[model samples]
Target chain A: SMFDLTGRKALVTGATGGLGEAIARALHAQGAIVGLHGTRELKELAAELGERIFVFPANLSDREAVKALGQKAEEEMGGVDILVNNAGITRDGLFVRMSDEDWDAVLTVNLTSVFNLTRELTHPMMRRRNGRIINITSIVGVTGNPGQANYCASKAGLIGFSKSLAQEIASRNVTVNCIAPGFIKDAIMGNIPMKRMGVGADIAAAVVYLASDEAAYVTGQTLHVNGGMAMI
Target chain B: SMFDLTGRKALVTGATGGLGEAIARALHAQGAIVGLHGTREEKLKELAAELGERIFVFPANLSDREAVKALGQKAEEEMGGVDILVNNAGITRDGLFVRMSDEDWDAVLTVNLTSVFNLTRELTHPMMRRRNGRIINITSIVGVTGNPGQANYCASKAGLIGFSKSLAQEIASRNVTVNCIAPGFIEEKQKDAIMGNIPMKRMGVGADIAAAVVYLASDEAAYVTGQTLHVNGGMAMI
Candidate 1:
């Protein structure tokens, strides 16, 4: 029940690079057509995947651009079965010094974008009675940080928001789950009990698994890929 | 945030031994009034005295459906409707699948699984009308991971999860949340049989299960429903 996404189409936001790029390529490679939503085009990656990639570039910060981009994707791709809300941005500063602009900027792009896309896209999934709604949250959501209060609040809010929605749609076989990734940086080989830093591929693999029939029983849960036992 | 359970009332089944006593004690210490339940009335008098104040004794054989239902009604009558229900009554019948008797299977399933079914079904309708309730089942980790020779036990534990989820969805709009707490590697024989799997390098304490229940029953977890909080000390993360 891993995945066989032949005719399945996926709408993945934040596909410019790093985690997003890998997710887009991974899904395209596994037989699903990709609705690649990003601010800038992935020329090399999209060309590599050939014509199957439908690049819909939009300014996610603008509500109207996002609404148009979302509507076009749903119409062009027929209907998206796998929806990944992976778009995010962060502004770091001490809580007391944080400006209203910085706080609202991070909240709009990172959190509000999730609501925008999910509301626009979820009606089709509900009609089908089968879908996967995946959100990419951060480890800081569970473990707080010194200067990332605004960022942390948005991510943690995503988890609580996801849980409320999971209960609402779980009986319909539409599973909503969040995956928390550690700060993808330096590797601590001996320290990682599973023996490696968070693999960009492994996070994508969890999403692919969630998209399959096997995860219908799984919902309202968060899978931590934070290179286990860092806090312990 | 952790909860201060003052003014809340809780009824914990199987208060005579194992995890239930700890669960009962923890709630009592936290300021929640408690109803101590067991098969014999005397088994709970000592517990009620130990709890200090705002405690009552309720006894009923869980396998007897009439007794279990009667226990719910009486507890509600005294406690002014149970605010939280901890369905902890369970028994194990371990025998190899091919060699297992019909009596063993029936006894395990009826006592462990159906007991929960009868109690929750009998108990929660009143809780729902009040527009606030919490149902926590003390399920074993084996409910998610099956065990050999405990086929009857496994089915009952797993059955508790299925039953809770169905009921959770039905009444979530009424401010009722149903959930489970899965404890790993307790009991004498279970300790030696699976010591290597736990990542924490120690067996879990009763307070571990107790605190998890406290959280689920708290106002802090008001929005959470149809979920399982695994208290297995990292042995498994399901």
Candidate 2:
């Protein structure tokens, strides 16, 4: 009935890095015991938000590392009630000149890693009959962008994947949703109908909404946290 | 965004019973004065009795354009002015396209689709007067992921999304917002056959649909316009 997350344990990938760091901080503020995943240390964030923030380093491009990291997160966090697949990468280059290595890297990091992590954590959610999977996407994914074919496909793929999974498992009370954020910086802000640049935390508000009981009925949906940038 | 509807005036059509009743109840619970419209006097009576003060009941059969027109005007007069309009009234006439009759299509569309136009057309200018408004159209997820044996219903709901987006863009500058809430299957609908298909393993309740309506109508969602909120419990992720 409320947006309380006191009993929720969240695994927020990409929490130790840019943009997403604020997302993790907001989740922490909302009472989510945050699992900080990245190639960085959580000393400062842990000091700020207390010992609930735990660091788990892994390279998402490697399937084996992702598998092991999932086990470790489950063990340390007790059991993840909310999963934020916020980790992603962009290898921007023209489609014609794009190399196999670049395409594969972006796809593995962006899409494959999502598949790997979500598969690992959803079982506990299904057993418990409650969970929230909020994937962080971009506006470019909905409205295609130039020079970022791989990134766009991965993002677009993530949304489609989310929809498919949402329908198949909604009966389990585990929602899979997407947050498509745009602007502030280039592609999204210029198009926003609000006619102003939006701060990053605006998108974080969406994650909180979806993760909370406040959004219990909301599933298989995309919260376009942009300032009216893309209406899809 | 957090949901809050203090000091808001709401008019929920089809509020006599079922899901619409839940939506109207949600708006009232959140601190909004509500005008409940329907064709059934008894249903409206029970709800009004439960709600006590700041609740108005307007009776109208949506198929009649005259009733719809008068309904909006009377609602405006009673509520002072409507800030949040939940176009929750609709009907479903099921049959394959080949077997569907013109009467069925017209009835469903007139009640589900045109009723929105008649009621909202009258309410929009009033909302624009104060430079604030919330327009939330209720639809089903089948409108997004088209379902078999529901062509007329889908078309009506799909039309809602398109219409809402257009109206949303037109009035966003004035702080008036238009959005859609697509509810999926409810819990009482044959759980065994449905659970296998839905991701959440269970159907949603009136509160689920009502919650989305509440969010769209609230001040926290002022920036959220021209969008469809899926309150389907992972039934369809549009």
Candidate 3:
């Protein structure tokens, strides 16, 4: 009863990925109408998810495509009660050897793309007086990692932006938050408290909690599902 | 295995209070030698007696810097050394900002903020030397999300968090971690007006905060440094 998402219209970006697919599936399982945003495997996911699922694929890097994605989801779903900005890219390299093109590509696809989509969708939530904006970040975003300067900066930027936006729109009943996953596919087990890497389900459960009515008071916060890897 | 604290020695301030007593009991339950600091010697003696062995009562006023420093020295002298420091002592002088006085403001800040600095200053060097320690300060939800008529209280608690972060970063490499627990409306005191703010529709209990203290104090939480764990039942998620 606490985490019910019944009758809610949700949109999840990068729904073709393992983590994103899990999130979309989890939200739908909670009785939400989920909009799957990605190209590859989008049709399969929509088909598997059956009813209450909509596929609206778009290249996040393209500004116009992201806007259209948001518009289409909003129009098709009638109104998005939840927006999961889960789509992100990585351009890993030593800071010194990293090129401008790579930097721009990572930041644009990971950070700027979120801005474009959120800008297009946030207004409807504010007007409706209720919404949940969940941005998926990484443990490295808070704890800096080597060869991930560009990725870290983009992920970290999303945190700052989420906090600012959370405070700005909290009064309107629209909460903005982030979930920093810990080693879903990567980890040094000795460094984690649970001594194990995370799974996509670990992150999906967190998204469902944030999207639920139970987490209404939660905002401007980053829920770390990192198994106590990096507490802050 | 990481939760064990058999050989560790801990000092918990305000051990006579509901939350403080609960923390002392928890740390001792983990088999740590505990020094109970409180102004009420009678209450401390009762708790120490009930706890039986490996308990020390060091009565001291947190508002008095000299007494706080002496309490720190007494704990170390009596118990050898403190492996964990739980700064759970705090005071509330609540009033609207318009009518707030310097006495109320200074009293809260001095007792809540400066007093922590005094006691922690005395114990940190040993922790740094040993390359092991846990400093868990009890903050509040009010500090994270401001509340009306509690400007002084909020400021002091907020300052504690900022202070914990800086100290955490400074000593993290030393294997010493500093963190804060921001509890919402614990069952110790509350009413209907406060009940509505918490999504759980209930007040938190002493065990809630005590469990968190144990977690942060344990070796399992070594990676959790310079952060505030909000155990507020969804009152203020931050």
Native contacts, share recovered per candidate: 0.00, 0.00, 0.00
Specify the poorest-scoring 10-residue window by lDDT in model 1 chain A: A183-192
Q: Residue-wise lDDT of candidate 2 within A1-232, one digit each (tens)?
A: 3677876899888877665787887788888889888866666776788856788888888888887788889888899989999989887765435555665577577766776688778777888899899998777666655566567656655665566567656788988888988764545446678988766588777889999987878887878877787786
Q: Pick the candidate with the highest lDDT.
A: 3
Please state the CAPRI-style docking class of candidate 3: incorrect
Residues A1-232 of candidate 1: C-alpha lDDT, one tens digit per residue: 3477777889889888778877877787778889888888576677888967788888889877887877888899998888888889888875435555665677567655675677677667778888888999877665545466556656655665566556666666777888888756234466556666666787788777777667788886778877783441
- Per-residue lDDT of B101-168 in model 1, one digit per residue for the tens? 55675577667765676677666778888889899988888765655566566656655665465566
* Best-to-worst ranking by TM-score: 3, 2, 1
Superior candidate under TM-score, 2 versus 3: 3
Higher-ranked by lDDT: 2 or 3: 3
Q: In model 2, which runs have C-alpha deviations exceeding 4 angstroms? A: A1-232, B187-191
TM-score (chain A) of candidate 2?
0.94
Give each model's whole-structure lDDT.
0.76, 0.77, 0.82
DockQ of 3: 0.02
Candidate 1: deviation at residue B230, Å?
Answer: 0.6
Better of 1 and 3 by lDDT: 3
